[PDB]
Amino acid sequence: LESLQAEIKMLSDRKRELEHRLSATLEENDLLQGTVEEL
Amino acid sequence: LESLQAEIKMLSDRKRELEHRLSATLEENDLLQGTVEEL
Q: List the disulfide bonds (chains A, B).
């Protein structure tokens, strides 16, 4: 059961990395949108 | 183990909730980027 919990934690870390990447993409696209709004 | 495995699974579910909400926001932002390209 401990091995299963560790695997779940590893998957949670992978999901955290994915969420961070999505937040970074959102921030970059929002910066592009802000420049577009200035234009 | 019964008190920790369920917590870890719920944490993974919340990570999936964040991933789903952020990816939905990213797709909606891509659609809004198509609209902004029309603009």
A: none
